[PDB]
Amino acid sequence: AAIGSCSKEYRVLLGQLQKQTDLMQDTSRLLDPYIRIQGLDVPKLREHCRERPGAFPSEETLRGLGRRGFLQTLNATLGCVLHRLADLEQRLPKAQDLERSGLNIEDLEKLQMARPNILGLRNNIYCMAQLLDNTPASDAFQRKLEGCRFLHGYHRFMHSVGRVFSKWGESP
Amino acid sequence: PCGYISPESPVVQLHSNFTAVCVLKEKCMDYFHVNANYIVWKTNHFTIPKEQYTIINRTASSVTFTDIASLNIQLTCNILTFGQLEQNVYGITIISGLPPEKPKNLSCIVNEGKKMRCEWDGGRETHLETNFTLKSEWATHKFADCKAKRDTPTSCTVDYSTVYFVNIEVWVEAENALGKVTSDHINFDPVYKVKPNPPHNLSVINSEELSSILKLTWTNPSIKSVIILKYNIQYRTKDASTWSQIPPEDTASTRSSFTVQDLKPFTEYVFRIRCMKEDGKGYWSDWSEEASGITYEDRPSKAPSFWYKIDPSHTQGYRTVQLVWKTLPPFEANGKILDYEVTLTRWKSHLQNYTVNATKLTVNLTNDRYLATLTVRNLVGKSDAAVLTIPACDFQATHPVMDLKAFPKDNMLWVEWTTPRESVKKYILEWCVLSDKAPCITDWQQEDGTVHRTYLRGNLAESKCYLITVTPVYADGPGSPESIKAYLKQAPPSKGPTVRTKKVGKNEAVLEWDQLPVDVQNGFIRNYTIFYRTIIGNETAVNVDSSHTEYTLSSLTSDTLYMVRMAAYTDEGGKDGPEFTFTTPK
Amino acid sequence: HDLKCVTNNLQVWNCSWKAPSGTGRGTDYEVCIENRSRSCYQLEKTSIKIPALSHGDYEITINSLHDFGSSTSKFTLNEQNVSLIPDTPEILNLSADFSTSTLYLKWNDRGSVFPHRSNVIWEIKVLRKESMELVKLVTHNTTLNGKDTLHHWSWASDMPLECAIHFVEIRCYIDNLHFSGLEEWSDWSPVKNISWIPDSQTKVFPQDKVILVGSDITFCCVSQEKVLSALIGHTNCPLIHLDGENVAIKIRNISVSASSGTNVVFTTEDNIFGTVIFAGYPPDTPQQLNCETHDLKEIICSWNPGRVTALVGPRATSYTLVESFSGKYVRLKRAEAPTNESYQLLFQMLPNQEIYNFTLNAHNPLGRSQSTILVNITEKVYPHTPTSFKVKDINSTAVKLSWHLPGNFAKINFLCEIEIKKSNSVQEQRNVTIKGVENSSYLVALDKLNPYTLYTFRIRCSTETFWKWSKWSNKKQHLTTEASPSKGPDTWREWSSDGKNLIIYWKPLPINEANGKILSYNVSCSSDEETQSLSEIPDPQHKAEIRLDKNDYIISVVAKNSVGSSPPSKIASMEIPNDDLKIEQVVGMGKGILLTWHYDPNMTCDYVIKWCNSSRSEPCLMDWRKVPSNSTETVIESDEFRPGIRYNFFLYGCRNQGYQLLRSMIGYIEELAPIVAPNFTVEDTSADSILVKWEDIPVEELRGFLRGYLFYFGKGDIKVKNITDISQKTLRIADLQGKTSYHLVLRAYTDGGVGPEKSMYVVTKE
Ligand SMILES: *[C@@H]1O[C@H](CO)[C@@H](O[C@@H]2O[C@H](CO)[C@@H](O)[C@H](O)[C@H]2NC(C)=O)[C@H](O)[C@H]1NC(C)=O
Ligand SMILES: *[C@@H]1O[C@H](CO)[C@@H](O[C@@H]2O[C@H](CO)[C@@H](O)[C@H](O)[C@H]2NC(C)=O)[C@H](O)[C@H]1NC(C)=O
Ligand SMILES: *[C@@H]1O[C@H](CO)[C@@H](O[C@@H]2O[C@H](CO)[C@@H](O)[C@H](O)[C@H]2NC(C)=O)[C@H](O)[C@H]1NC(C)=O
Ligand SMILES: *[C@@H]1O[C@H](CO)[C@@H](O[C@@H]2O[C@H](CO)[C@@H](O)[C@H](O)[C@H]2NC(C)=O)[C@H](O)[C@H]1NC(C)=O
Ligand SMILES: *[C@@H]1O[C@H](CO)[C@@H](O[C@@H]2O[C@H](CO)[C@@H](O)[C@H](O)[C@H]2NC(C)=O)[C@H](O)[C@H]1NC(C)=O
Ligand SMILES: *[C@@H]1O[C@H](CO)[C@@H](O)[C@H](O)[C@H]1NC(C)=O
Ligand SMILES: *[C@@H]1O[C@H](CO)[C@@H](O)[C@H](O)[C@H]1NC(C)=O
Ligand SMILES: *[C@@H]1O[C@H](CO)[C@@H](O)[C@H](O)[C@H]1NC(C)=O
Ligand SMILES: *[C@@H]1O[C@H](CO)[C@@H](O)[C@H](O)[C@H]1NC(C)=O
Ligand SMILES: *[C@@H]1O[C@H](CO)[C@@H](O)[C@H](O)[C@H]1NC(C)=O
Ligand SMILES: *[C@@H]1O[C@H](CO)[C@@H](O)[C@H](O)[C@H]1NC(C)=O
Ligand SMILES: *[C@@H]1O[C@H](CO)[C@@H](O)[C@H](O)[C@H]1NC(C)=O
Ligand SMILES: *[C@@H]1O[C@H](CO)[C@@H](O)[C@H](O)[C@H]1NC(C)=O
Ligand SMILES: *[C@@H]1O[C@H](CO)[C@@H](O)[C@H](O)[C@H]1NC(C)=O
C-alpha cells in the first residue's frame, strides 16, 4: 500500500527539505507568539529569553558530522522537541480564555501548524534516509523563562541546520 | 406459522443465479397429512412449473431462477391439502441487485492555509449505494480517512493541516457489499496544487509629469514568502469592452507595483489581476476587483476651421463682416477649449487682436484688404493660425471650379468638382434648404485643397432640396461661387399641380399650370402627364416635358364635357392632382 | 518616714518603708500593727509582709534597734492607701503558623492566687521591625475563678513572616470590686520573639495565592543583592525599604487576573525574580437548574453558571450533585463542555422512586454555592423522536401506519397526532390514543379518506402528562388505492351528414366524481331485443362511432376502472323531426347567456342544449349540458364565449324516448349600442332631390342586431324618417328646394342602445 520512500527524485527532495527548513526558521512565527501569549511582552523580560549553553548541538558539531549521523541526530532532536511541544501544549490555556483575557488565538494556530511541520520534516528525513540507500517542582514564572530558553535554542538549531542544508548543494 | 423461505431477504444481482428454499415444519405436516411433494411455487405473475423446482427431502423444496430481469418478485411457497385447497405459507422479495464499478479522474486541490480536497467521478449507475473512501498516507505515517457523504459522493475534506513539501500518495478505494476495488496510486507535492488567493485592495495612481503612465498598487497574499508567484494584468478603456492583456514576461516575478505605458489622451482605464505559481503548476487565482483610474492629460494642437461672411447692408465707409469658426473635435482639441483669439491685420497698419469665448465674432471692417488669423488657446498654449485673406470691395472673384456634380452615395450627398488651374489653398461648402417661407440656415464646412470630393458633415433631412455652394480659396481671395441643387432622398410630390384653361375652341383647348413649390416637390421633377377623359369615353394619357408650362389638345369633339387631370412624376413616383372639368363650345 | 504598702494577692500586704537618717547597715527593726492582739516580730530589712487586715485605720509603730538609742515613729495605714500591684505575667509557649502567617500565644493567669472572682483585663502588644515599631494592641478580658486557666490567643498577619522578625509583649490589670484601694497595672512580661531561619530557597512571597478581586495583598522579596524596582505587569510600584535589602509593595483593589496571572516581578542588577498571583471571584449560584429525563432510566440535568469564576486549570470550579433520599453523589470530570452545552450531568434513576429532591453544590478554592429543587421524574419526561415510520395499505378506504418508540412506557399512554397533508388542499390533523408498551412498535390505521390521492404522512406524539412535544418524524409519501367509481359521465349523441353513422360524445369524469383514473369507456348501442356493438375505447379518446340500422337503439356509455364499472348513463338515439322551427335572438348578460323556453309537459327525461362556433367552416367543438325537466330557465357558463362571435343554441326535447328539437337561438356574449356610425356619401344631387348611400356595418363593431337607420335632415325644422329595412341601402328625398344648406345626420340604433352619428354639409344643385 504505502511506498517505502515518499519520493525518488533527490533534487526535488533536497529542495523540499531546504524550503521546509527556511520556512520553519521563522522566529517571528514561532518564538514571538509564545512571548506574546505568555504575558512577557515587555523589553526587560524579553532581554532574558535567551539560549542557555548545552541545550542544542552546535554549528561546528553539525558541520563536522557526516550524513547518516546528521540524520539520526536531527531525528532524535525532532523527537525531543515534539515531546517538549506536547508538554507546552498541555500547559497553554484554552482559546476561549485567551479571547476573554484579550490575547489572540493566532499564537495557538501557529503552534498547532508548526507541530505538523515538525512531523512532515521528520517524514522527509526518513524519506531521504531511505532514498540514499548507503527538578521535582518548578515555579510558574520559571516555566515561562524555561520556555523562552528552549525556544531560543530551537531557533538557533534551526538556523544551524538551515545553514548546513544550504552548504551542500548536490550529492550523488 | 409453519414454514420459512431461506434466505429471508435476498438481494441477488440482476440476470444472475438464485435459489430459494421453502422449508416447512412437522406441525402442518402431520396436521394436514402433507409433505414436501405437495409444495408448489407461485410468483406474483405466474405459477412455477413442476420441472423448475427440485425436492430436497421429505420436508424441503428448492427452486432456481436462471434470469432475474424484474425489479420486484414476490416468491411464495404454498401447500396442497385435501380438496384442492391452497394455503399461503411465506413470501420473499429481491430488490435492486447490481454491483458498482471503480472510479477514476483522481485530482486534488489545495487552498491557502486550508485542508486538501480531492474529487473523482461516480461512474456507471449501479442502482445501489457505494461508500467511496480515499486513503492518504506518507511513506511512514498513516492519516485518517473520509467517508463519502450522501449529498456529494465525489468530495472529501481531510481533518489534518496541509504539510507542504511532502510527497503524499493518495488513492480512492471503492467498497460495497459485493467486493472492494482500489483506483490508481498517485504521488504529488501539495504545494503544486495550491490555489492562491486573488489580490485585494487594488489602486491606480496617475502621474503629474508624464501623461502616459499609471502606478498600479495591490496587496499580495501571505504565501508570497513561500513560493515565487507571477501576475497577469488585463487593462481596457471605458468605451471598449475588449480586455488587453499585459504580456506575462514583465510580471513573472514577485512584485506589488507595475507601470502601464502608451495611454496618452485623457482616458480612464479598468484593471484586474490574478496570480499563480511561477512555474505554471497549480491553478490561477480569481480576478481582482475592478479598479478605475484616470491618467494625466496631454495637450497637443490641431488646425481649426475659419470662414467669413459679408452682409448686403453696407454702411457708408465701413462694412459689417462677421467671422465664424467651428469647434474642434475631441480627438483634435485634446482638452478643454479655453477661448478663441482672432487677429485682424491690414496692409501695413495697426494690429487688432480680439479674444472671443464663442464661435462667432462680427467687427466693423473698412474697404481695404485685410488678413484674418484664427488661433485657439489651450492649457499648454495656442494652436496654428488659420490664414484667410479678406478681399477688398473692388476685388472680383475669378477662377471658379469646374465639373459641378452632386449625387447621393450611401445615403449621403457627395459633391465632386475639378480643381482649377491655380494653386488652391482651401475649400468652403455652403448649403441651405430651399423654401418659399423660410430663409437659409447657412451651415458650412472647411476641407483641404488637395481633395476634390467631400461629403456634407451634418444632419441632412430627406425630401429637401439643398443648394450647395462651393468657393475655392486662393492666396489673394475666394473664387467665384457656384451653386447646385440636390436631394437627400427623392419622394413623390405631396400634391399635384392645378390646371386652368387659357382658350377653348371648337376642337382645341389650351391649358396652363404653375410650377410646384420646392417644399412640395420632394425631388427633381422629370416630366409631366395630363389625363383627359370623357364621361362615356376612355381615359388617355399624354407626355409633356417639365420645361413647358402649357399644352394643347387636338382631335377634340364639340358638344361634349371633358374632365382633365394632371400629375407630377418623380424618380420614385407621382401623385395626381385635382380634377378639372370644362365644356366644348359649338 | 514614708510608708508605702503593696499587695499582689489580696491576702498578704508587703509594706515597705524608708530607713531613718543615720541608720547604718545591719539595723534591727521591731515593726508591728496595733490590733486586737498585739503580736510584734523582729526583722532585719525595711520590708514587712503582713496579712490582710479588716476595714479600718491601723496604727503601725516602728522601732529602730541601735546601740546608741532607739527611734519610735507611728504610721496610719488603711485599705484605701495600699496599692494593688499584681505579679507580672509570663509567656509559657509562643508558636507561629508559617503557611498562613498567624501567631499563637499561651499564658497562665494563676487563678489560685486570688480566692474571689475578679475581672482581669489583658493587653497584648505585637511588635516587629527590630529597630523599633508598634503594630497591634488588642484588649482581652477574662474571669478568675480561683483556678489556673490556660488561655489562647491568635492573630493573622498581613506581611510575610520571612521578611521581618516580630516581638510579643503582654500585661494584665485585674479588677476587684471588694478592694477599695488603688489598683495598678502589672509590669510587662519579658519579651518573647519569634525568629525564622533564612534558608532563602525562593525570593518573592507568597507563591500562587488565590485571593478575591478587590482585596488588599502585600508582597515581599528577600534578597542579598541590591534591587532596582518592582513591576506588576506594565505598572510600577513604590518600594518600601525593610530591614536589610528586603523590599515590600502594597496593592489596593487589585484588578482581574489574566490567564497566566498578574506576574509580580522584582528586577535586579543581572537577574529577575517573581511569582504569580491569581485574583478570582466567588462561585455564582447555578441558574436555570431543571432536570428531566428521556427514557425514564437516566436523569440528565443542565444548569447555567452565570458569572464566570475567572479561575481555570487546576483551580476550576468543580460541581457536585448529591441525592437527598439516597445520599448518592456524582462528580464531573475535568473535561468540560463548550459554551452551547456549558454544563450537563447524568444521574441514574433508582427503582420504585419517583420523587426526587436534588441539591447541586459547587466549590472553588474561594467559596461554595448550592441550589435545591424538587422535581417529579414522571412529569418531566421527554418523548423520544419516533423512528422507522412505515405506511401500509389495507383496502380502498383505509391505510395503516406504524412507528417504533424505545422506552419503558408500559404504565403510561400515548397521545399521538397524525397529520394528513393532501396535495392542493387544507392541512388535516388527527389525534389518536394508544396504550404505551415496553419497546415495541405501535400500529394505528385510519379510514374515511378519498381514494386515488397522494398523501404525505408525518406523526409526532406526546405523553398524557402533556409536558413536552416530541419532534416531527420524517415525512413519508404514499399513494392510495386504484379508484372508486361513483357516477356516470355526461353523454350526447349526434348524427353524421350521411344519415347512417351516429357519433357519440362524452365528457371526462372529474376527480371528485370519478375518484380515480379512468381506464376505458364501455359504449354500447343496444335495442330492446338484443345487445349489439359492445366496444371499449380507451383514454383520451372521448368520441366513438357505431353503425346502426334503426333509431330505437339506446346508448349506454360506461366508464371502466380498475375495480369495477361506472354507473351507466342512458341516452336516446331517435331524433323526432320538428318542422315548426324558428330562429330567435338572445343577449348575453355579462359572461353567460340566458335561455328562456316554455315548460312542455310531454318531456320525459331531461333537456339538452348544445352550442358551437358558427363563424368557422371547420367542424364545431360542440358542448352540451343536461338540464332536468323541472327547470325552465338556465344559463350557459363556458370559457370559449368571446365577444363578436355568434353561437347557435339548439334546444332538444325528451319526448317518448326521442330528442326532438324545440328552439334554435343565436346570439353573442355581449350586445350593446354600436361604436361607430355608418359612413355615408352623396352620389347625385338635383335641384329638387338628393341621393345618399351608406356602407353596411360589419358585425364586429355593430355589437348586436342592427334594426335600421335613423336619417336626419334639415336646414342649417328637422325631420325624422326611420328606415327599418336592413337591406335597403339607398335613400332619396323628394320635395326639395334649391340653394339651401341642409345638415344630413345618420345614426344607427339597435336593441341595446343607439350608436353615434355622422354629419356633413352639402349644397343642393340649381
Ligand atoms: C527516528 O526516530 C524514531 C523514534 O521515534 C525511530 O523509531 C521509528 O519510529 C517510527 C514512529 O512512527 C516507526 O514508524 C518506525 O518503525 C521506528 N523505527 C524502527 C527501526 O523501529 C526511527 O527508527 C528513527 N529513524 C532512523 C532513520 O533512525
Ligand atoms: C444458476 O442456475 C442457472 C439455471 O440452472 C444456470 O445458469 C447457467 O449459466 C451458465 C453460465 O453463464 C450458462 O452457460 C447456462 O446456459 C445457464 N443455464 C443453464 C440451464 O445452465 C447455472 O446453474 C447458474 N448460473 C450461474 C451464472 O452460476
Ligand atoms: C530573638 O529570638 C532568639 C531565639 O529565638 C534570641 O536568641 C537567644 O538569645 C539569648 C540571649 O542572647 C540566648 O541565651 C539564646 O540561646 C538565643 N537563642 C538561640 C540562639 O536560639 C534572640 O536574642 C531574640 N532577639 C533578637 C533581637 O534576635
Ligand atoms: C432536600 O434535601 C435536603 C438535603 O440536602 C434537605 O435538607 C435541606 O438542605 C438545605 C440545603 O440547601 C437546607 O437549606 C435546608 O434547611 C434543609 N432542610 C432540612 C429540613 O434539613 C431538604 O429538606 C430536602 N427538601 C425537602 C423539601 O425536604
Ligand atoms: C408525580 O407524577 C405522578 C404521575 O403524573 C403523579 O401521580 C399521579 O397522581 C394523580 C393524583 O392527582 C393520579 O390521578 C394519577 O393517576 C397519578 N399518575 C400515575 C399513578 O401514573 C404524582 O402525584 C406526582 N407527584 C407530585 C408530588 O407532583
Ligand atoms: C431436509 O432439508 C431441510 C433443508 O433446510 C432441513 O429441514 C433438513 O436438512 C432436512 N430435514 C429432514 C427431516 O430430512
Ligand atoms: C476528468 O474530468 C475533467 C473535468 O474537469 C475532464 O477533463 C474529463 O471529464 C475527465 N478527463 C479524463 C481524462 O478522464
Ligand atoms: C483595501 O480597500 C478595501 C476597500 O476600500 C478595504 O477592505 C481596505 O481598505 C483594504 N483591504 C484590506 C484587506 O485591508
Ligand atoms: C467661457 O470661457 C470659460 C473659460 O474660463 C469656459 O467656461 C468656456 O470656454 C466659455 N463658457 C461657455 C459657457 O461657453
Ligand atoms: C494682441 O492685442 C492685445 C491687445 O488687447 C495684446 O494684449 C496682445 O499682446 C496682442 N498680441 C500679440 C501677439 O501682439
Ligand atoms: C459699427 O457697426 C455698426 C453695425 O452696423 C454700425 O453702428 C456702424 O456700421 C459702425 N459704427 C461705428 C461707430 O463704427
Ligand atoms: C479600585 O481600584 C482602582 C485602581 O485600579 C482604584 O483607583 C479605586 O480607588 C479602587 N476602588 C475602591 C473602592 O477601592
Ligand atoms: C376498508 O377497511 C376499513 C377498516 O378501517 C373499513 O372500515 C371499511 O368499511 C373498508 N371498506 C371496504 C369497501 O371494504
Ligand atoms: C425491546 O426491548 C425488550 C427488553 O425489555 C426486548 O425484550 C424486546 O425484544 C425488544 N424489542 C425489539 C423489537 O427490539
JSON list of C-alpha atoms in Angstrom, two decimals, chain A residues 60-111:
[
{"chain": "A", "resi": 60, "resn": "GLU", "atom": "CA", "xyz": [30.64, 23.26, 14.47]},
{"chain": "A", "resi": 61, "resn": "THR", "atom": "CA", "xyz": [29.35, 19.84, 15.52]},
{"chain": "A", "resi": 62, "resn": "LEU", "atom": "CA", "xyz": [26.68, 19.89, 12.81]},
{"chain": "A", "resi": 63, "resn": "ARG", "atom": "CA", "xyz": [29.32, 20.79, 10.21]},
{"chain": "A", "resi": 64, "resn": "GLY", "atom": "CA", "xyz": [31.73, 18.10, 11.41]},
{"chain": "A", "resi": 65, "resn": "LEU", "atom": "CA", "xyz": [29.06, 15.39, 11.48]},
{"chain": "A", "resi": 66, "resn": "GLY", "atom": "CA", "xyz": [28.53, 13.24, 8.40]},
{"chain": "A", "resi": 67, "resn": "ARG", "atom": "CA", "xyz": [25.24, 12.31, 6.72]},
{"chain": "A", "resi": 68, "resn": "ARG", "atom": "CA", "xyz": [23.69, 9.31, 8.50]},
{"chain": "A", "resi": 69, "resn": "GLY", "atom": "CA", "xyz": [24.80, 10.59, 11.90]},
{"chain": "A", "resi": 70, "resn": "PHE", "atom": "CA", "xyz": [23.45, 14.02, 10.98]},
{"chain": "A", "resi": 71, "resn": "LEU", "atom": "CA", "xyz": [20.09, 12.48, 10.07]},
{"chain": "A", "resi": 72, "resn": "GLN", "atom": "CA", "xyz": [19.97, 10.42, 13.27]},
{"chain": "A", "resi": 73, "resn": "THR", "atom": "CA", "xyz": [20.82, 13.44, 15.43]},
{"chain": "A", "resi": 74, "resn": "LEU", "atom": "CA", "xyz": [18.16, 15.51, 13.66]},
{"chain": "A", "resi": 75, "resn": "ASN", "atom": "CA", "xyz": [15.63, 12.70, 14.19]},
{"chain": "A", "resi": 76, "resn": "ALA", "atom": "CA", "xyz": [16.39, 12.48, 17.92]},
{"chain": "A", "resi": 77, "resn": "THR", "atom": "CA", "xyz": [16.26, 16.27, 18.26]},
{"chain": "A", "resi": 78, "resn": "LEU", "atom": "CA", "xyz": [12.91, 16.40, 16.46]},
{"chain": "A", "resi": 79, "resn": "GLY", "atom": "CA", "xyz": [11.57, 13.74, 18.81]},
{"chain": "A", "resi": 80, "resn": "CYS", "atom": "CA", "xyz": [12.71, 15.67, 21.88]},
{"chain": "A", "resi": 81, "resn": "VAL", "atom": "CA", "xyz": [11.24, 18.93, 20.57]},
{"chain": "A", "resi": 82, "resn": "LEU", "atom": "CA", "xyz": [7.98, 17.10, 19.78]},
{"chain": "A", "resi": 83, "resn": "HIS", "atom": "CA", "xyz": [7.79, 15.83, 23.37]},
{"chain": "A", "resi": 84, "resn": "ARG", "atom": "CA", "xyz": [8.52, 19.28, 24.80]},
{"chain": "A", "resi": 85, "resn": "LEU", "atom": "CA", "xyz": [5.99, 20.87, 22.43]},
{"chain": "A", "resi": 86, "resn": "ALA", "atom": "CA", "xyz": [3.33, 18.39, 23.54]},
{"chain": "A", "resi": 87, "resn": "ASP", "atom": "CA", "xyz": [4.14, 19.36, 27.13]},
{"chain": "A", "resi": 88, "resn": "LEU", "atom": "CA", "xyz": [3.85, 23.07, 26.28]},
{"chain": "A", "resi": 89, "resn": "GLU", "atom": "CA", "xyz": [0.54, 22.48, 24.50]},
{"chain": "A", "resi": 90, "resn": "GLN", "atom": "CA", "xyz": [-0.65, 20.71, 27.65]},
{"chain": "A", "resi": 91, "resn": "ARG", "atom": "CA", "xyz": [0.48, 23.79, 29.60]},
{"chain": "A", "resi": 92, "resn": "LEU", "atom": "CA", "xyz": [-1.05, 26.57, 27.49]},
{"chain": "A", "resi": 93, "resn": "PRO", "atom": "CA", "xyz": [-4.61, 27.79, 28.23]},
{"chain": "A", "resi": 94, "resn": "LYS", "atom": "CA", "xyz": [-7.72, 27.49, 26.06]},
{"chain": "A", "resi": 95, "resn": "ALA", "atom": "CA", "xyz": [-8.75, 29.71, 23.16]},
{"chain": "A", "resi": 96, "resn": "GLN", "atom": "CA", "xyz": [-11.91, 30.94, 24.88]},
{"chain": "A", "resi": 97, "resn": "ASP", "atom": "CA", "xyz": [-9.89, 32.01, 27.93]},
{"chain": "A", "resi": 98, "resn": "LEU", "atom": "CA", "xyz": [-7.36, 33.71, 25.64]},
{"chain": "A", "resi": 99, "resn": "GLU", "atom": "CA", "xyz": [-10.12, 35.65, 23.89]},
{"chain": "A", "resi": 100, "resn": "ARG", "atom": "CA", "xyz": [-11.70, 36.57, 27.24]},
{"chain": "A", "resi": 101, "resn": "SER", "atom": "CA", "xyz": [-8.39, 37.84, 28.65]},
{"chain": "A", "resi": 102, "resn": "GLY", "atom": "CA", "xyz": [-7.65, 39.77, 25.46]},
{"chain": "A", "resi": 103, "resn": "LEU", "atom": "CA", "xyz": [-4.95, 37.69, 23.81]},
{"chain": "A", "resi": 104, "resn": "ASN", "atom": "CA", "xyz": [-5.04, 36.29, 20.26]},
{"chain": "A", "resi": 105, "resn": "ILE", "atom": "CA", "xyz": [-5.53, 32.72, 19.04]},
{"chain": "A", "resi": 106, "resn": "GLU", "atom": "CA", "xyz": [-3.04, 33.28, 16.21]},
{"chain": "A", "resi": 107, "resn": "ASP", "atom": "CA", "xyz": [-0.27, 32.08, 18.52]},
{"chain": "A", "resi": 108, "resn": "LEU", "atom": "CA", "xyz": [-2.05, 28.79, 19.22]},
{"chain": "A", "resi": 109, "resn": "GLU", "atom": "CA", "xyz": [-2.78, 28.45, 15.50]},
{"chain": "A", "resi": 110, "resn": "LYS", "atom": "CA", "xyz": [0.89, 28.97, 14.66]},
{"chain": "A", "resi": 111, "resn": "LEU", "atom": "CA", "xyz": [1.97, 26.35, 17.21]}
]
